[PDB]
Design a binder for these strands. Structure first.
Ligand code: SF4
Length: 260
DNA sequence: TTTTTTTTT
């Protein structure tokens, strides 16, 4: 009678949350039900204000220096707000906007095909959200409705300090959101042309493989439509296929999972 | 709710 978002008290979701769902949807569900395993700010209007201030600083950096790291992304995807952080964004020598996702491994082994499908899906989500932000499909009203940010509340001295040191003078969280929308959509920010995953050995720094994700919008949209169907409560969570039963060996919830 | 990172007889 209650959806998983309501039962787990989740106002939105993380990008990796849907990536774990590609690994095993039921394992992601148990991770939210039983969490016992798995700038100074004590409020959510400031925490989102800091995220906005970083966006307003990384947009001009990317458009001049041509290389930024830790770029926040957010947006509503089939009824659920999705939040994430892109690791790297830079312009190639040819002029393409590339997304670099570095994945370090302790053992020099090639990544499993099951691991790469989870990783290919994660960066595709990053592009799915990024393309929507820079094209005007992510509005401040869309953010308020899902996060329940109170714009009437003033931002604390923690943020106004971090803002005046950056040269910008914030008055309200509302004025900050309107500049973020304008800067994202009116600064010639192109779509992401290349999605590149790289697997690196932690010690020897050996390249364990390079993945250039073949992005297909209709395929990506279809999967999150299916994945969000669980979170909104329109279907029951599903475990791994019988072929991937080796995942249940290293799963924390193997001794309570009735799928197994 | 500050997102994610990384798996493994
Ligand atoms: S035991 Fe297997 S099916 Fe059950 S949650 Fe873990 S990985 Fe998924």
């Amino acid at each position: 009678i209650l959806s998983p978002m309501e039962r787990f008290h989740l106002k939105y979701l993380y990008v990796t949350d849907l990536a774990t769902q590609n690994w095993c949807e039921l394992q992601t569900a148990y991770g939210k039900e039983l969490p016992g395993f798995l700038v100074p700010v004590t409020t959510k209007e400031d925490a989102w204000a800091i995220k906005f201030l970083n966006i307003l600083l990384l947009i001009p950096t990317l458009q001049s220096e041509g290389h930024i790291r830790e770029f926040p992304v957010f947006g509503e995807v089939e009824g659920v707000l999705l939040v994430g952080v892109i690791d790297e964004l830079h312009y190639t020598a040819k002029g393409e906007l590339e997304l670099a996702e570095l994945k370090t491994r302790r053992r020099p082994m090639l990544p499993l095909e099951a691991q790469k499908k989870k990783d290919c899906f994660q960066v595709s989500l990053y592009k799915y959200i990024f393309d929507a932000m820079v094209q005007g499909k992510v509005t401040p009203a869309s953010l308020i409705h899902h996060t329940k940010l109170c714009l009437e509340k003033p931002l604390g001295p923690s943020v106004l300090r971090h803002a005046q040191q950056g040269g910008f003078s914030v008055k309200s969280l509302g004025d900050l959101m309107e500049l973020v929308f304008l800067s994202l959509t009116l600064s010639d920010l192109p779509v992401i042309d290349i999605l590149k995953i790289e697997y690196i050995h932690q010690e020897t720094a050996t390249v364990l493989g390079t993945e250039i994700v073949a992005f297909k919008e209709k395929e990506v949209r279809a999967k999150v439509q299916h994945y969000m169907a669980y979170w909104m409560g329109h279907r029951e969570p599903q475990g791994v296929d019988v072929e991937e039963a080796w995942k249940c060996r290293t799963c924390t919830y193997a001794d309570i999972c009735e799928w197994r």
